[PDB]
Symmetry: D2
Subunit: 304 residues, 4 copies
């Protein structure tokens, strides 16, 4: 019934050691993530370090990744901007390059620039008017913006392209419950995020998709498959086995988790963030790899 | 002693009602602000709605304004970006177009992405390494980032281009006092902002420059002139006369103040912000103009 | 129509230099504030350093101040607490001690403990059930809690004692406009706060009362009187003359403004806050007194 | 060398169906937590719903719990208050009633009242001067106050009783590493919190104690025992087994987790919070118990 479901991991942005885009590693990262079983990919999100790249780089990356994916899986392009017209233009460009969906935070800037509900509604309505592909509303702490379940459901019911949701604020499971109740069939994609840290609770609440980190979608996807098939005990057992790694990503190694794994595995040439984002503490990295090696993820045995 | 002192108002970004850049009104605003007596200008700051424009637009505005100013007054170009290399590249481009100085917030994104002191220091150090013009550190609530007076003084002493400071966090006067005490001659420009709302206290604290709104620099500049000449009572009397307008800008009409005054005066064609930023409440606008008309500001009698 | 209007300044809590309550100074501060023309008083609010005192001290101060006022002016007692039952009990105690009104923030704690709208409604509904005097809902940044104009108006319409509001979040004037419109005759008291810094805009918006600092209500009250009488230009003139002092209180000397002035004038024995609240920088204090002397407020010539 | 180490779970506050304190259930919860093997107990913290109780209730709970513990295990009494003198008085009273240690957040109030580093130092220095038992500094999001590792280490080196730390801000493991590096043997207790969600990473970083929720200390303590004995694989296996329950507590059922489990097990009479704190969603509670029953915790087979 929904056009999209399952696991849509966030593609990290691969830099060279000196900070320029490393497009050769970017393509390998994409190929690994498809081989790991991803149902689709999300690019230029926060786990992609989007705040560290330029508009020109955003376009190069969108072109490069969509062309390299070559229709194998659907791609969600994150297009957030404070300006309605800028977001609409980015979203139309992403559509013309082959995106299956765009994702946008509500408009915000920094710690203090926020937008009232009425204008947030207009923002998403005008982005929807400009495109013919679905919009995923991102509900995440980084925007510092409250998007209530009734407001989110109203957008799904009333705005043509608003149909998908990445719910990552605290209490996401019970918010997903309310979103589904109020939105009904207009909620095509009640999805969660935050590296799958709350995936078990969110599946109980009705989530049908998960936007995870890019390092081990092969570890997480069978949880969603087991859940959809009614194999709830198998889903729990898989969640339990992978939860220490999900937890280390969520709390310790963060955005850089996927790149540290891909570098250790020979998928990418450099795991560095763009300065000034702090590099991983060597103990945090060592502990990451120690947990990962217990689980034998594809990322450490793909390039070899 | 210092290379720059006095009033450096923020140039608003002028749009058509449609949201496109209005570069004709943009140049008229610049000419009015120079005619009002500004010692210099600051572009692409938060009162310029910089969060609502693209990289391409940033370059168009920088080139257009610097060319139109044509060396009549120094221009500070705001170049903030999370990425060190992006900020350095923007700052070099601003220099190449004729900027006297760049202003940069510390690296941040949204409500949740913050950078430790050690990496903030490296951020400014690397921007400094790239350019020949001075850096103004912006200390403002929008970044959600704490920059202590000891830390700011250390950057002034240890980083070649860090020499100017826009202090607009709460308690700016006593922060300016401590910055000057700890930094000495390395504090070339202890400046304030926030539309001049705390100008009197900040002058007592030793501020030598003020980054105000663009609607009435002619009202504010004689306060700084009087202060420098030791005419403290003339400064106070002028502050008292203009404080209700400063206060209405700070608390009621905000960013759109300068544009509402400029539109009423025929300086610019449209006072609208870029969507989704809310437009001015009609009563807020009417009360703004009522206060301004008590003060005979140049913006309402600029016959060019 | 309304039971209460005008200026209701916040009474500072007077401590000895040692930190103990100084009740002798507390009573003098109250007497000065009444002599300054206050239409009423508000006690135990944030400008009273309520976060620095104990429950026992709250009760001592409520009893002492209400007895000393002796019905001369109405007193709003601030009773905020996270717990509904504790707030309701404090409010009933305040009523029994002679309060004309209670003020309560929505329930909150610290930076992170917040309460959904539905339970905030139940909080105020249950406090209202316990008492027979009106409630003032405080809409202020300290709570970190969003109270929309429609929600506030719904509480006024549906909860018997909810009838007054202290609006001091950013954009208070236009929130007051919407609250007054949506709430209609249920909005008995649309008031502002924040030391009167936005008073002119808030009066344009329909505010009928102002909860200010306690140092110079005589400076501010004629703005409200002029406004009520239609003398809008006189109101502007008074606002303009006093705005540098209001601005210094709002941005520089803060909570300690009233006590610094009262100590300079000999009204109270000590201007000190309770530790760890920072003491005034000496230049901040000197600049405060320099502005104040120019305006000749009662506090410097009362004792 | 440290005086205290191991697992010190937070004791929930048990209310009756009426919202009054239920001291009979309170004592049973203490007995269960001791029977579960706790090395010590922490009372009146935020996981104890301390923001919902009165000063009188705080004193009754401190007396009741310390007397009931009867010296069986050491008790940390949380004494946070904005006022230095109030915190010091609470801490001295806790000491006189038998507390082994006090825990205090830095002084704060609400979303907006914060204290500069210099006055935070003075706050802890003066509390230390008042008492003869150690202080645990709580580094937690609820205070909205930044306490850098250099500042925490400085307090440990310069303030006699500051010796223990509950680090539960984001990135606690890296912060604990830096605190230990900078403070040396002045850091007697580098501990973590947040229900043990980051316990494995924090143990790698040098944590010697954990302040967890009160529902299943028996599940968590073997992780710390294995770590201290060098059985790092055993620690991982136990952490992995219990992490789904820790995670559900941390993200879904929160403060009420321990009370829901204790009520289900017959330890306490009522699991309600005080109004207006939201009650547990029925699905969240059912899912909590489903996970818990896979792990056979003592709380469901105690009474």
């Amino acid at each position: 019934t929904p056009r999209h479901r399952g696991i849509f991991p966030v593609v990290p942005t691969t830099f060279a050691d000196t900070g320029e885009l490393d497009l050769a590693s970017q393509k390998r990262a994409v190929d690994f993530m498809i081989d790991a079983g991803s149902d689709g990919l999300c690019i230029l999100a926060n786990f992609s370090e989007q705040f560290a790249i330029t508009d020109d780089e955003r376009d190069v990356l969108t072109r490069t990744i969509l062309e390299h994916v070559a229709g194998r899986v659907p791609v969600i392009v994150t297009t957030s901007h404070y300006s309605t017209q800028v977001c609409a233009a980015r979203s139309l460009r992403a559509q013309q390059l082959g995106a299956a969906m765009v994702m946008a935070m509500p408009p915000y800037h920094g710690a203090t620039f926020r937008v009232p509900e009425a204008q947030i509604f207009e923002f998403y309505a005008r982005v929807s008017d400009a495109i013919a592909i679905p919009i995923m509303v991102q509900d995440a702490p980084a925007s510092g913006t409250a998007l209530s379940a009734p407001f989110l459901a109203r957008m799904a019911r009333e705005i043509e392209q608003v149909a998908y949701f990445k719910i990552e604020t605290p209490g996401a499971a019970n918010k997903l419950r309310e979103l589904i109740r109020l939105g009904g069939d207009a909620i095509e994609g009640p999805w969660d995020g935050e590296e799958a840290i709350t995936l078990l609770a969110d599946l109980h609440a009705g989530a049908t998709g998960a936007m995870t980190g890019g390092g081990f979608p092969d570890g997480i996807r069978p949880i969603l498959e087991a859940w959809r098939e009614g194999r709830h005990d198998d889903a729990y057992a898989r969640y339990q086995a992978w939860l220490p790694l999900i937890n280390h990503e969520n709390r310790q190694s963060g955005i850089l988790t996927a790149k540290a794994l891909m570098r250790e595995g020979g998928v990418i040439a450099s795991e560095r963030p763009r300065h000034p984002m702090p590099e991983l503490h060597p103990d945090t990295r060592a502990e990451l790899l120690a947990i990962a090696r217990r689980l034998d993820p594809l990322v450490l045995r793909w390039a070899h």
